[PDB]
């Protein structure tokens, strides 16, 4: 919910710096990812409604124990709000931030063998919307810069024409590029249209609307932080600053 | 063709008063909506015309 | 300190002419240390003496 609310590149990377890896990993068993299932949608149909479960749903799924599953759990958390079930990763890796895993070699995780095409296909890039594809491409660029695979990232964009048009423009080592970026990455937000307490047909759409309706409740909740009215009560370390720089950028 | 949005809406209300002087309820109701809309400023005046 | 509530127009269309460059006072302090220190100590002492 909090990760889906971020609407700018600066906010997204700032959230990932303060968020540990354990938030990406889920400890609920879930179900196997790719299955043709029948779900109940009584608002629309009397018969059961066919659908296919996927990894970018908002509900936890079972994940492979390899490094591929860990990266695929991080991206699903960013684009869908929930991760997958990969237990016994370890204290050392789980305490690191999401940005450290994606960008830093000191974590101890080796990810240079990853194939962006296979990861995108397993994440069902075809079913993703524009904001979801932009968020995943941000994760790919950070991984490419960590492994020195910038050339491979560019070629993968050349093969996929729709991905090249929406590819965010920022150098993963320079903070000046992040501040200038004006891409809108928000998935949930205050809706200008009429939003009703109604169900959706597919699993992805229904789960997304739950976060959208939950965010509205979160926005008016006491947990939400109102910068306009309570800026002085925020701690100085985590207070918003114009000259905000990620470490090493 | 000329003039600001605020002037366009305010002068229209005065013409409504002159045209509908026999029925004063129209201008009073029209000005009730403008009072709430106009608090935002020029953006609120645009909403009133919309 | 109680936060100030700005009007909705000012949040959307508000602008301020401010010069935000900060000039150092070191050239005055470093050159004249005895004079600068004595002036500020005297001003501070007068305030604290009335607590």
DSSP readout, C1-51? -PPP---HHHHHH-------PPPPSHHHHHHSHHHHHHHHHHHHHHHHTT-
| CA distance linking residue A3 with residue A75, whole number of Å | 11
Contacts 24+ apart (CB under 8 A), C5-14: C5/A229, C6/A228, C8/B39, C8/B40, C8/B41, C9/B40, C9/B41, C11/A228, C12/B41, C12/B43, C13/B41
Task: Give the span between the Cα atoms of A76 and A24, in whole angstroms.
Answer: 8
Task: Give, as one character, the DSSP assignment of residue A18.
Answer: H
Cβ neighbours for A204, distance < 8 A, ≥ 6 positions apart: A54, A56, A57, A58, A80, A127
A27: its two tokens = 């400890």
Do A87 and A103 contact (CB within 8 A), yes or no?
no
- Token pair in block for residue A18: 């303060």
Structure tokens at A86: 């990969």
Residue A84's DSSP bridge partners are: A61
Please give the Cα distance from A76 to A99 (Å, whole number): 15
Report the residue of B6, B40, B45, B46 to disrupt the C interface, i.e. the one with the largest count of C CBs within 10 Å: B40
Q: State the method.
A: cryo-EM
Cβ within 8 Å of residue A29, ≥6 positions away: A60, A62, A85
Per CB-CB distance under 8 Å, the chain B contacts of C11 are none
Nearest-angstrom CA–CA distance, B43 and B32:
17
Find, among A47, A43, A93, A46, the residue nearest to A73 by Cα.
Answer: A93
Q: C1 touching A, CB under 8 A?
A: yes
Choose the mutation target among A226, A227, A228 for the interface with C, i.e. most C CBs under 10 Å.
Answer: A228
Which of A106, A51, A56 has the alpha carbon at shortest distance from A82? A56
Asked if A206 and A198 count as a contact pair (C-beta separation under 8 A), the reply is: no
d(CA A146, CA A153): 12
Query: How are beta strands A84-85 and A61-62 bridged, if at all?
Result: parallel
Tell me how close the Cα of B42 comes to any Cα of chain C, in angstroms: 9
Distance between CA A73 and CA A56 in Å, rounded? 9
CA distance A217 to A195: 13
Instruction: Report the residue of chain C nearest B41, measured CA to CA.
Output: C9
Instruction: Tell which B residues from 29 to 48 touch C, by Cβ distance under 8 Å.
Output: 39-41, 43
Task: For B14-40, give one letter per residue: b (16+ CB within 10 A) or e.
Answer: eeeeeeeeeeeeebeebeeebeebbeb
CA–CA gap between residue A163 and residue A88 (Å, rounded) = 35
Give dist(CA A170, CA A160) in Å, integer.
Answer: 19
What is the DSSP secondary-structure string of A19-76? SBGGGTS--S--B-SS-EEEE--TTT-SS-EEEE--TTSSS-EE--SSHHHHHHHHHH
The whole-angstrom separation of Cα A82 and Cα A23 is 8
Note whether C12 and B43 are within 8 A (CB).
yes
Residue numbers after which chain B is interrupted (C to N above 2.5 A) read none
């Amino acid at each position: 919910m909090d990760v889906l609310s971020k609407g700018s590149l600066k906010e997204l990377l700032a959230h990932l710096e303060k968020t540990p890896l354990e938030e990406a990993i889920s400890y609920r068993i879930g179900t196997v990812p790719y299955q043709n299932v029948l779900i109940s949608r009584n608002e629309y149909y009397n018969q059961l409604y066919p659908d296919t479960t996927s990894l970018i749903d908002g509900v936890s799924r079972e994940g492979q124990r390899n490094v591929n599953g860990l990266i695929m759990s991080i991206i699903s958390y960013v684009v869908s709000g929930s991760g997958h079930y990969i237990p016994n990763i370890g204290f050392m890796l789980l305490r690191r931030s999401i940005l450290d895993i994606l960008t830093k070699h000191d974590t101890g995780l080796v990810t240079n063998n990853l194939n962006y095409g296979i990861i995108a296909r397993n994440l069902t890039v075809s079913k993703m919307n524009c904001e979801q594809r932009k968020r995943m491409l941000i994760c790919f660029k950070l991984l490419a810069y960590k492994d020195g695979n910038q050339n491979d990232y560019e070629i993968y964009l050349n093969q996929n024409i729709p991905l090249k048009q929406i590819a965010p423009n920022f150098i993963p080592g320079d903070m000046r590029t992040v501040i200038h970026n004006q891409d809108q990455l928000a998935i949930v937000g205050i809706p200008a249209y009429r939003l009703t307490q109604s169900t959706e047909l597919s699993i992805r759409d229904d789960n997304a609307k739950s976060y959208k309706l939950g965010y509205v409740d979160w926005y008016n909740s006491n947990s939400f932080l109102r910068e306009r009215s309570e800026f002085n009560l925020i701690r100085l370390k985590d207070r918003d600053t114009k000259y905000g720089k990620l470490n090493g950028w | 063709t000329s003039g600001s949005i605020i002037n366009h809406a305010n002068n229209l209300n005065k013409v409504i008063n002159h045209v509908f002087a026999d029925k004063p309820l129209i201008s009073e109701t029209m000005l009730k909506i403008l009072t709430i809309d106009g608090t935002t400023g020029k953006d609120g005046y645009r909403n009133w015309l919309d | 300190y109680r936060p100030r509530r700005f009007k909705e127009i000012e949040h959307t269309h508000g602008y301020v002419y401010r010069e935000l460059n900060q000039g150092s006072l070191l050239p005055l302090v470093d050159a004249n240390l005895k004079e600068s220190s004595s002036y500020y100590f005297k001003k501070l002492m007068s305030s604290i003496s009335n607590v």
